[PDB]
Design a protein around this nucleic acid. Structure first.
Ligand SMILES: Nc1nc2c(ncn2[C@@H]2O[C@H](COP(=O)(O)OP(=O)(O)OP(=O)(O)O)[C@@H](O)[C@H]2O)c(=O)[nH]1
Ligand SMILES: Nc1nc2c(ncn2[C@@H]2O[C@H](COP(=O)(O)OP(=O)(O)OP(=O)(O)O)[C@@H](O)[C@H]2O)c(=O)[nH]1
Ligand SMILES: [Mg+2]
Ligand SMILES: [Mg+2]
Lengths: 135, 96, 447, 230, 331, 244
RNA sequence: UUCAUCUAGACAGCCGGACGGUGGCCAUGGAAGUCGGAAUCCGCUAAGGAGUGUGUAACAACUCACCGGCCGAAUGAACUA
RNA sequence: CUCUUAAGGUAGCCAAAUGGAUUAACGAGAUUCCCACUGUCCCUAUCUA
RNA sequence: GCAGUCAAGCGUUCAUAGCGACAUUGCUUUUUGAUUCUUCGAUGUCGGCUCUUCCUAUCAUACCGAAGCAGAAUUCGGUAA
C-alpha cells in the first residue's frame, strides 16, 4: 500500500470487478468501471473486490472525451453496503461512489460532492482536504 | 496430469477421525508444567455455559488506531458456583 | 539521462552458454520414451528448441535496452563517452549483439518447422541437437564484444551526474595550480590531494547553495600547451567540459614558486585556450599567493600579466588555500557574474515574466477602514528561552519521558494530569455519563 | 560515488584487519576442498566438474612444455606475405533406403478409406518454375519446408567451403525414380554453380557449373553438405 | 580500445583547431535541442506516466486476417495458381492494395503473372474510375469490374483475357488462377458472376470465405478463391482497418467514438439525404437527432447511442452512403 | 521562525494539527514525536492538547477557531467536548455547531479579525461564527475555488493563496482581509497551501520537503523572523525568476 | 615398474646473499625487472632472469628462480594393478 | 509489325417512374450483438410437500 | 553436420600401417543497437473443468557464497519440497 496513512482495518467488500460507480469529484467524468483492485489476495475463482477507502483501477464509461480509453487510479469513498463501525453500529450510504486520483494518492479535481466516509478520509490525507462533508 | 492450477486443501487432517466424542465432558490432556517454589493452588475449574451478551470497554493499547477510543464486543458468561473437594489421587512414574 | 547506473549485467560467452543451457534442462521435462506417440515425441523437442531460443533472445534484449544509445542523448555526454569508450567500438559491439539476436531467432524459427515432419525419436533428437548446437556456435563468437561491454557497463555506472543546463562554475588550469584544493574548500568531496601533475584523471563534481539557489562546481584534470593535435584522452575531458557547458570559468594561476612554472608559458596556454571563452565570462584568479604577493612582480612580468586584461572581459582577484576566508568572495563574485547573464537571458523570453507575475508580486490592502487590527503575541513567549538540543539542563521534552519509561508503542501517556480544575486532587476522576436511561451530560449544567 | 571510490577508500583506510590471513587460509583449504568436491557432486555436476578438471590439466601440460622449449630454441610475394587465410567418388556404397520409409501414406475422404496419396519425407530440389499441381490430380506430395535451394560445398584441396546454389540432381543412388523426383539423400550427386570460386579452363573459358557429392543425411539436420568433384 | 590494457591515448582524429571545434559544438547543441522541441509537439506520454494512468489493451477483433491459419492458405493458393489476380476496392484502392506480397511474388515466383482487378465500380463516378484505371495501368494490366450475376460489367473482358493466358501455356493441360485481396472486396462475387450461378457463398459480413475452393470453367482453366488477408503493418491506425471494411462492427466496444471519422470522410450534403436529416454539428448531436427521429429510445426515454452508431458504420461500409477517395491528379 | 517537521511520514501538517495564537491541538496516533516537535518550539508558553474529533486523527479539517473561541462539528462526542473544555482555559469559548458542511477547517478560513466562508454555509452558522470568534464574515471563493479554508493560509500578518489565483482576485481579497497576499506553494510544489502548514503571529510549521525558495516566501510574507517586512521580496525577485 | 638427488649433507623448515653497465632501447603526462612492443646481450661470481608475484602516480619495500649457513638419512617424479 | 491506357473534380450522358438479386411478408430453419433481467457466478444459507 | 589443422596417449613392438581425447579454423547474407511487415502442407489427436497425492530438475518465503556489492534495487550459485 503506497500513499496511504497507516494500517487499514477490514470492512465488508461490496463492489467486485465489473461494477460501475459514480464520480464524485468534478474532473469531468460521470461514472467509473472497476477492473482491478490494488492490494488484493489470490484464490481460485475469487473475484477481486473493493470496499470503502480502497484504491482501484478504472476506466471512464461516460464523461469527458479527453478522459476515456485510459485506465486510471481511483479511491472508493461511498459504498451502499452495510458495514460495521467500532462504536458499534452498522451503516450504509445511498450509492457507490469514488474519485479519480494518482498513484501517490493526490486528487485530480478540486472539490468532492456529498458525504465521505471517515474510513477513507482518515486513510488518504488529500481526500480529507477536498471533502467538504465527512460522513 | 498435474491439476493445472494449485489450490489449498479442504479441511484439516489433524482433527481426524471426525467421530463422536466419548463423553459429554471433555477431558484435560495437559496441565501447566510445575514449580515447587510456589504456593499450592488449583489449575482448572468446572462451569456451565450460559449465553452471550455485549460489552463496551475503554481501550488502552499504545500503537493501535483505537488507543483512547471505545470498542463494542461480545462476551460469554459461564456460571460457576463453588466446587467441593472429595478426594485425592497419587500417580507413580513408570517407564511406561 | 543523467547517470545510467541500472544496466543489468553481462556475462561472458562461456558462462552465458551455461546459464541458458542449464535453464532449459532444469525448467523443461526430461524423460521421453520411444513407445509414446509420435505427436508427443515431436512436441517434446519443439519445446526444447523454443525455450532455449527465448532464453538467448531475452538475454540479448536486456543489453540492447540498457545501454544509453550514444547517438541523440546530448552533445556533451556524447563527446565525453566518445573520448572515454571509443564511439566506433561502442556502436560496433552493440550491432554485433543485435545481429546475433536476429540470427538466433531465425534458427529457432526454422528448426521447429523441420521438427514437425520428423518420423522417429532418433531423427527428432538429432534435429534438436543440431538447433541447439548452431545456437551455441552463434553465441561463442561474441567472446570479444561481451567482454568489452562488461567493462564499459561497470565504468559507466560510476560516472558523475553532470547536468548541462544548470548553474555551473568550471575550475581549470595547469597541473598543480590549486583547483582541486579550491573545489575541496568550497564543496565537500573526496579528491586525492597529493602534489604531482596528474593526481586526477577525470572530472569531479560538487554542489553548494548560494542565495537560496543550487550551484555545481566542476574540477577538470588540466591541459598542457601541446599544439592541439597531440593531446590525450585526458585533456579532451577538460576541453569538452569548457566547450559544452554554459558556466563561469575560474582560471587559476600559480604565480608562485612551488611548481612555479614559466608565466610566459601559462599566459600562452591561456591565450591558446582563449577561443573556448566565447561567452563564458571568465575570471582569472591568482592562487598560492601567501608566499609571493604579486604586487612585488617585475615590470616585464607585469606586462605579461597585463596581456590578459585586453580580452573582452576578465576580472582579476587573488587568494590562497591557507587564509580560507577571502576565498568565499571569489565564488560569490563568480556566482553574481553567472546570475547576471542567467536573469537577463530568462527575461529575454518575455512570456515567462507575464505568467510568473503571480508569484513575485504582493497585493496591498488599500486599508478600507480605520479599525485597528494589530498582531497579538503573549508574554509567556517573549519570556521563553531557546531549546538547545545539547545543553546539560534544558526542557524535558515529553518524548524523552516516552523513550525512558518506556518505548514508542509501549508507553501509555496519561491524557489527564495536563489540565486545569478548581482542585488538582480530583483530576484522576470518572464522569458517569449514564443513569437508568438518562444520559447524564444532558441534565448536567450549573444552576 | 562518481569515480574509483572503492580504490580510493582502500588507499585511504584499507580493506580490513583480518583480510590477508583469511585469504591466505582460504588458499590453503583450497586443495582440501577441491578433492572433497570430486567425491561428492553427484549427477551431472560430477561430469561438468571432471571435464574442466581434465581440460585444466591439459592446459598446464601445454604451458609447461612450451616454457621448457623456450630455453634452448612457401615463397609468397611481398604483398601476399604479412597476410593470412582413378575416377572413383569419395562415397561409394552408402546404406540403402527402402520405399517404406521416405514415403508416407495420406488418407482421404470423410471416413478416411481412399488413401492413394504419398508424401516424401526427405529433402528435395524441386526445380525452377515449380507451380504445384491441382489437389485432385496431385499424388506425390513434396512439402514446402523440405525444399532446398543451396548447399555448403567444399574444395578437397584449397581448404575452403562456400554456399553455392544447386542447379540439378544429376544422379541419386538406389533408384532412378528418386533421381527424377529430385531427392537429396546421402551419396547423391548434384550440380552446383561455382562462379564464386573463379575457375578458368584451358582455352580461357569460365567454368560456372560442376558436380559435387552430398556427404551427410540432411534429414537429421538442415544443411546440405557437399564435396566438390575435382 | 578500453580495459585493463587499453593501449590508446589520443582521440580520433585530432580535430584541426579549437576555432572550428567550438563552431561544430555550438551548432550541434542547437541542432540537438530543436529536435526535442519538435518531438515534444509531435508527441507527451511522460505526463501520462506522472498521472500514473495508461492506455487500455487493444481489442482482438482488430487482428484479422492475420493469424497464420489463413496465411497458410495464402501461400498454398499462390503455389498452386498459375496466374494471380489482386482485387481492389474502387472507393479507396490504395488502402486495400496490400503491396507486401508483390515483393514476394516478384522475388520467389517470377513466372506467375499477377494482374489487377478493380471492382465495385458502380459506387464511384465514371471519371474517378477511369482515372484510377489509368493511374494503376503503369504497373500492371488492371481491368475494371462490377460483379453481379444478372447485371455485371467486365465479364467479357475478363473471359477473353483468361483465354489468352490459357493459349500461352498450350502445353500445361490446364491453368489455375487465384483471387486474392482484402476481406469484403468481392473475390467470391467475381467467381459467381463469371460462372453465372451461386457457386461460392457471399455475404456482407467480412469473414465469409474461410478455406480455399476449386471451381472449373472451360475444362482447361480453374479458379481458386481464398480468405481475405490484412498484412500485419505495425503502423497506420486502429481506425483505418475499420473504414476499410475488415472488422465485424458488432464487436467493437464503443462504436460512437468513430463517427467523427464518418463525418470527415463523407459529405454533409450526401449525409443529409439518407436519414433524412436535421441540421447539426458535433457528431454527438448528429447521433442524437438521428436516434430521436428513428425511435431508437432506451428504457425511458433517452436515445440509444451505440445501437445507432453500429448501423451508421454498417451503412457506411455496405454501400448505402456515397463516398470515395479522390484519384491522383493529372500530370 | 519557520520549522519543518512531519506527522508519521506525511507532510500535511495542517491536516493533523491546528495552531492558533493561544493554543495548539495535535493528533494522538503512535508516539510523542509530533507533540515534541511543538513542545521544542513553544515549551510551556501555550497549551498543547492531544485530541481527536469524532474518533479520527484529521483534527485540522474538522475544527475552526482563533484566540477567542473554537468551533467543533456535530459529530463530536460529549467525551471529547468535555476533554477540550477541561484542557483549555476559560478565556476561550467553545461551541459545537450543527452545519451540513461538517468540515469546518475546509469551510472557514479565519484569523483574529476576519473570516472567509464557503458560499453555501447557512445562516445559523454564519451568525454563530461572528458571535463566538468575534470576527467579520465574507462569503467568497479563491479564484473560483470552493473550500477557502484549505486553499489559503491566514495570519494577522499576511496570507498565502494557491498559485492559480488571479492577480485581480489577489487584489480584491487583500482589500477584504487587510493583509498582504502572495501565490506560492508548499511541500515541493503543492497547491493545497492551507492543508500543508500551520501558521500564526509568531510561528510557522511546514512539511519536510518545503524547499528553500518556498521557506523564504513563507518566512517573508508572514513576517516571521525579525525582520522580514514584506518588501524583502525585492531582494527575492531574482531567485523567484530563476525558480519559476 | 621405470628414472633421478644424496654424508664433496638429500627432502621440510628457519637465517644470510639476491650484484655491476643499468632508470638497457621504442614508446608518453607518468612506466626505474613487473600497463605495453622488439631483443633478450655483456661483466663479475658460490649464485643472482634486461625478471615469478605482491606494491607505488612514478620510486622505495617484501618475495621465488638460483646460491650459502643451522640440523642430520633417506627423498622426489612419472607410470601400471 | 495487320494490333490494344482515350474519359477529370462529390455524381455522367442516355434509355421508358426505374436502372433492381443489397428482393417485402412469413418461420418449432442456422447465426452475431444490444437494452432489460436475473443464484449463471463471487458463495452460499434457509423453507414446504 | 561436413571438410580440414593440431597432438597426450593407444595400437604386438610402430607415429608416419593406423586410430586418436582436449584445443582450433572454414560458412548459413549486409561490422555502426537500423526493423526484418516467413506467418509456407503436423493425416492424427488437445483442452478444461472437480478433487487428492507424489517427485525436484526451486518461481516466492528461511538461511548462506561470489560479484565495482557505497546505500537502494539486482545478477550468478549452495542447502532446502
Ligand atoms: N602551501 C600551499 N600550497 C598550495 C596552496 N594552494 C595549492 N597548493 C598546492 O597544491 C598542491 C595540490 O594540488 P592542487 O591544490 O589540488 O592543484 P592541482 O594539482 O592542479 O589540482 P588537480 O589537478 O585537480 O588535482 C599542494 O601540494 C600544494 O602544494 C596554498 O594555498 N598553500
Ligand atoms: N455495390 C456493389 N457491391 C458489391 C459488388 N460486388 C460485391 N458487392 C458486395 O460486397 C460483398 C462481397 O462479398 P464477397 O463477394 O464474399 O467478397 P469477399 O469477402 O472478398 O469474398 P470471400 O472470399 O467469399 O470472403 C457482398 O455483400 C456484395 O453484396 C459490386 O460490384 N457493387
Ligand atoms: Mg594532482
Ligand atoms: Mg470475405
Amino acid at each position: 500500500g503506497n500513499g496511504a496513512q497507516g494500517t487499514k482495518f477490514r470492512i465488508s467488500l461490496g463492489l467486485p470487478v465489473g461494477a460501475i460507480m459514480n464520480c464524485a469529484d468534478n474532473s469531468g467524468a460521470r461514472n467509473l468501471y472497476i477492473i482491478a483492485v490494488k492490494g488484493s489476495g489470490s484464490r481460485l475463482n475469487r473475484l477481486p473486490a473493493a470496499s470503502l477507502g480502497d484504491m482501484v483501477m478504472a476506466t471512464v464509461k461516460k464523461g469527458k472525451p479527453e478522459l476515456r480509453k485510459k485506465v486510471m487510479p481511483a479511491i472508493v469513498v461511498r459504498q451502499a453496503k452495510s458495514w460495521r463501525r467500532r462504536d458499534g453500529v452498522f451503516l450504509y450510504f445511498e450509492d457507490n461512489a469514488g474519485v479519480i486520483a494518482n498513484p501517490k494518492g493526490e486528487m485530480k479535481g478540486s472539490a468532492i460532492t456529498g458525504p465521505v466516509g471517515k474510513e477513507c478520509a482518515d486513510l488518504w490525507p488529500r481526500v480529507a482536504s477536498n471533502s467538504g462533508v465527512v460522513v | 496430469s498435474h491439476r493445472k492450477y494449485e489450490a489449498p486443501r479442504h479441511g484439516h487432517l489433524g482433527f481426524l477421525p471426525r467421530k463422536r466424542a466419548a463423553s459429554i465432558r471433555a477431558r484435560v490432556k495437559a496441565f501447566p508444567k510445575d514449580d515447587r517454589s510456589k504456593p499450592v493452588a488449583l489449575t482448572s475449574f468446572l462451569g456451565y455455559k450460559a449465553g452471550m451478551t455485549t460489552i463496551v470497554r475503554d481501550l488502552d493499547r499504545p500503537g493501535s488506531k483505537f488507543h483512547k477510543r471505545e470498542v463494542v464486543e461480545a462476551v460469554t458468561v459461564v456460571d460457576t458456583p463453588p466446587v467441593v473437594v472429595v478426594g485425592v489421587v497419587g500417580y507413580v512414574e513408570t517407564p511406561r | 539521462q543523467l547517470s545510467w547506473k541500472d544496466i543489468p549485467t553481462v556475462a561472458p560467452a562461456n558462462d552465458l552458454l551455461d546459464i541458458v543451457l542449464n535453464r532449459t534442462q532444469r525448467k523443461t521435462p526430461t524423460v521421453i520414451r520411444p513407445g509414446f506417440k509420435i505427436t508427443r515425441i515431436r512436441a517434446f523437442y519443439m519445446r526444447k528448441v523454443k525455450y532455449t531460443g527465448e532464453g538467448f533472445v531475452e538475454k540479448f534484449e536486456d543489453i540492447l535496452k540498457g545501454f544509453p544509445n550514444i547517438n541523440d542523448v546530448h552533445p556533451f555526454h556524447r563527446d565525453l563517452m566518445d573520448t572515454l569508450y571509443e564511439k566506433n567500438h561502442y556502436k560496433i559491439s552493440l550491432a554485433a549483439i543485435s545481429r546475433a539476436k536476429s540470427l538466433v531467432e531465425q534458427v529457432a524459427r526454422d528448426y521447429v518447422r523441420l521438427l514437425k515432419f520428423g518420423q522417429s525419436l532418433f531423427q527428432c533428437k538429432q534435429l534438436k541437437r543440431a538447433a541447439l548446437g548452431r545456437m551455441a556456435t552463434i553465441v561463442k563468437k561474441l567472446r570479444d564484444p561481451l567482454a568489452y561491454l562488461e567493462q564499459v557497463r561497470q565504468h559507466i555506472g560510476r560516472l558523475p551526474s553532470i547536468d548541462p543546463n544548470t548553474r555551473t562554475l568550471l575550475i581549470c588550469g595547469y597541473p598543480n595550480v590549486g583547483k582541486s584544493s579550491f573545489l575541496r574548500c568550497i564543496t565537500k568531496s573526496d579528491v586525492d590531494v597529493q602534489p604531482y601533475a596528474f593526481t586526477t584523471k577525470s572530472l569531479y563534481v560538487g554542489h553548494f547553495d548560494y542565495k537560496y539557489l543550487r550551484f555545481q562546481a566542476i574540477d577538470t584534470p588540466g591541459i598542457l600547451d601541446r599544439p592541439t593535435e597531440e593531446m590525450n584522452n585526458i585533456e579532451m575531458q577538460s576541453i569538452y567540459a569548457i566547450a559544452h557547458l554554459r558556466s563561469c570559468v575560474l582560471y587559476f594561476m600559480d604565480l608562485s614558486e612551488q611548481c612555479g612554472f614559466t608565466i610566459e608559458a601559462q599566459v600562452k596556454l591561456f591565450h591558446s585556450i582563449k577561443p573556448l571563452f566565447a561567452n563564458k565570462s571568465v575570471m582569472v584568479v591568482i592562487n598560492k599567493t601567501d608566499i609571493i604577493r604579486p604586487e612585488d612582480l617585475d615590470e616585464e612580468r607585469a606586462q605579461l600579466l597585463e596581456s590578459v586584461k585586453e580580452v573582452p572581459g576578465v576580472e582579476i582577484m587573488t587568494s590562497s588555500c591557507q587564509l580560507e576566508e577571502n576565498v568565499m568572495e571569489v565564488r560569490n563574485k563568480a556566482c553574481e557574474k553567472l546570475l547576471a547573464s542567467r536573469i537577463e537571458n530568462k527575461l529575454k523570453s518575455q512570456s515567462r515574466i507575464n505568467n510568473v507575475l503571480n508569484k513575485i508580486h504582493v497585493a496591498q490592502p488599500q486599508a478600507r477602514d480605520d479599525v485597528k487590527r494589530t498582531p497579538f503575541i503573549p508574554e509567556s513567549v517573549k519570556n521563553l528561552k531557546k531549546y538547545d538540543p545539547e545543553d546539560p539542563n534544558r526542557r524535558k521534552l515529553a518524548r524523552d519521558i516516552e523513550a525512558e519509561n518506556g518505548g514508542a508503542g509501549v508507553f501509555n501517556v496519561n491524557l489527564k494530569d495536563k489540565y486545569l480544575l478548581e482542585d488538582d486532587e480530583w483530576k484522576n476522576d470518572i464522569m458517569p455519563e449514564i443513569l437508568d436511561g438518562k444520559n447524564v451530560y444532558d441534565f448536567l449544567d450549573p444552576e | 560515488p562518481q569515480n574509483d571510490y572503492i580504490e580510493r577508500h582502500i588507499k585511504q583506510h584499507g580493506k580490513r584487519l583480518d583480510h590477508e590471513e583469511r585469504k591466505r587460509k582460504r588458499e590453503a583449504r583450497e586443495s582440501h576442498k577441491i578433492s572433497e568436491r570430486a567425491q561428492k557432486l553427484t549427477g551431472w555436476k560430477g561430469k561438468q566438474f571432471a571435464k574442466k578438471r581434465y581440460a585444466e590439466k591439459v592446459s598446464m601440460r601445454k604451458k609447461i612444455k612450451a616454457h621448457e622449449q623456450s630455453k634452448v630454441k612457401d615463397a609468397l610475394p611481398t604483398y601476399l606475405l604479412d597476410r593470412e587465410q582413378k575416377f572413383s567418388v569419395p562415397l561409394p556404397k552408402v546404406r540403402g533406403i527402402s520405399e517404406e520409409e521416405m514415403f508416407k501414406v495420406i488418407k482421404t475422404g470423410k471416413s478416411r478409406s481412399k488413401s492413394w496419396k504419398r508424401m516424401i519425407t526427405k529433402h528435395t530440389f524441386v526445380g525452377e518454375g515449380f507451380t504445384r499441381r491441382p489437389v485432385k490430380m496431385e499424388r506425390i506430395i513434396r512439402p514446402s519446408a523440405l525444399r532446398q535451394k543451396k548447399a555448403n560445398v567444399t574444395h578437397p584441396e584449397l581448404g575452403v567451403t562456400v554456399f553455392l546454389p544447386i542447379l540439378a540432381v544429376k544422379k541419386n543412388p538406389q533408384s532412378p525414380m528418386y533421381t527424377q523426383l529430385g531427392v537429396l539423400t546421402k551419396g547423391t550427386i548434384i550440380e552446383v554453380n561455382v562462379s564464386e570460386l573463379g575457375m578458368v579452363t584451358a582455352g580461357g573459358k569460365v567454368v560456372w557449373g560442376k558436380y559435387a557429392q552430398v556427404t551427410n543425411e540432411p534429414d537429421r539436420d538442415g544443411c546440405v553438405n557437399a564435396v566438390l568433384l575435382v | 580500445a578500453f580495459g585493463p590494457k587499453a593501449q590508446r591515448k589520443r582521440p580520433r582524429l585530432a580535430a584541426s583547431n579549437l576555432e572550428d571545434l567550438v563552431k561544430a559544438t555550438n551548432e550541434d547543441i542547437t541542432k540537438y535541442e530543436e529536435k526535442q522541441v519538435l518531438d515534444a509537439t509531435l508527441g507527451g506520454n511522460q505526463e501520462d506516466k506522472e498521472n500514473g494512468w495508461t492506455s487500455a489493451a487493444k481489442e482482438a477483433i482488430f487482428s484479422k486476417g492475420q493469424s497464420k491459419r489463413i496465411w497458410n492458405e495464402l501461400y498454398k493458393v499462390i503455389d498452386s495458381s498459375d496466374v494471380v489476380i489482386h482485387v481492389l476496392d474502387a472507393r479507396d484502392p490504395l488502402g486495400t492494395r496490400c503491396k507486401s506480397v508483390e515483393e514476394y511474388m516478384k522475388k520467389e515466383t517470377p513466372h506467375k503473372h499477377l494482374i489487377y482487378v478493380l471492382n465495385k465500380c458502380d459506387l464511384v463516378p465514371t471519371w474517378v474510375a477511369a482515372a484510377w484505371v489509368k493511374h494503376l495501368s503503369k504497373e500492371r494490366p488492371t481491368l475494371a469490374f462490377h460483379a453481379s450475376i444478372t447485371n455485371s460489367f467486365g465479364k467479357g473482358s475478363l473471359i477473353q483475357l483468361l483465354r489468352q493466358f490459357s493459349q500461352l501455356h498450350t502445353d500445361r493441360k490446364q491453368i489455375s488462377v487465384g483471387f486474392i485481396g482484402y476481406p469484403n472486396t468481392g473475390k467470391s462475387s467475381i467467381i459467381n458472376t463469371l460462372r453465372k450461378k451461386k457457386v461460392c457463398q457471399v455475404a456482407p459480413i467480412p469473414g465469409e470465405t474461410k478455406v480455399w475452393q476449386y471451381i472449373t470453367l472451360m475444362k482447361r482453366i480453374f479458379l481458386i478463391d481464398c480468405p481475405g488477408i490484412v498484412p500485419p503493418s505495425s503502423k497506420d491506425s486502429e481506425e483505418d482497418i475499420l473504414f476499410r471494411g475488415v472488422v465485424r462492427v458488432e464487436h467493437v466496444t464503443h462504436p460512437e467514438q468513430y463517427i467523427p471519422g464518418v463525418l470527415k470522410r463523407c459529405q454533409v450534403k450526401h449525409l443529409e439525404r439518407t436519414y433524412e436529416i436535421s441540421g447539426w454539428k458535433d457528431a454527438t448531436e448528429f447521433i442524437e437527432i438521428l436516434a430521436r427521429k428513428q425511435g431508437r429510445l432506451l428504457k425511458g426515454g433517452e436515445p440509444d447511442e451505440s445501437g445507432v452508431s453500429k448501423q451508421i458504420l454498417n451503412d457506411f461500409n455496405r454501400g448505402k452512403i456515397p463516398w470515395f477517395v479522390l484519384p491522383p491528379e493529372k500530370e | 521562525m519557520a520549522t519543518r517537521t512531519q506527522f508519521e511520514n506525511s507532510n500535511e501538517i495542517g491536516v493533523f494539527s491546528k495552531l492558533t495564537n493561544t493554543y495548539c491541538l495535535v493528533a494522538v496516533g503512535g508516539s510523542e514525536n509530533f507533540y515534541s516537535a511543538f513542545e521544542a518550539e513553544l515549551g510551556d508558553a501555550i497549551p498543547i492538547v492531544h485530541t481527536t474529533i469524532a474518533g479520527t486523527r484529521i483534527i485540522g479539517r474538522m475544527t475552526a477557531g482563533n484566540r477567542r473561541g473554537l468551533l467543533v462539528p456535530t459529530q463530536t462526542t460529549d467525551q471529547e467536548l468535555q476533554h477540550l473544555r477541561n484542557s483549555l482555559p476559560d478565556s476561550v469559548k467553545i461551541q459545537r455547531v450543527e452545519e451540513r458542511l461538517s468540515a469546518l477547517g475546509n469551510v472557514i478560513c479565519c484569523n483574529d479579525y476576519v473570516a472567509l466562508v464557503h458560499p453555501d454555509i447557512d445562516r445559523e452558522t454564519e451568525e454563530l461564527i461572528s458571535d463566538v470568534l468575534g470576527v467579520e464574515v465574507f462569503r467568497q471563493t479563491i479564484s473560483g475555488n470552493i473550500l477557502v479554508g484549505s486553499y489559503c493560509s491566514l495570519s494577522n500578518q499576511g496570507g498565502l493563496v494557491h498559485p492559480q489565483t488571479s492577480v485581480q482576485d489577489q487584489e480584491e481579497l487583500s482589500s477584504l482581509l487587510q493583509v498582504p497576499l502572495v501565490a506560492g506553494t508548499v511541500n515541493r510544489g503543492s497547491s493545497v497551501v492551507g492543508a500543508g502548514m500551520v501558521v500564526n503571529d509568531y510561528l510557522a510549521v511546514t512539511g519536510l520537503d518545503t524547499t528553500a525558495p518556498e521557506l523564504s516566501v513563507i518566512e517573508s510574507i508572514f513576517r516571521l523572523q525579525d525582520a522580514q517586512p514584506e518588501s524583502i521580496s525585492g531582494n527575492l525577485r531574482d531567485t523567484l525568476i530563476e525558480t519559476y
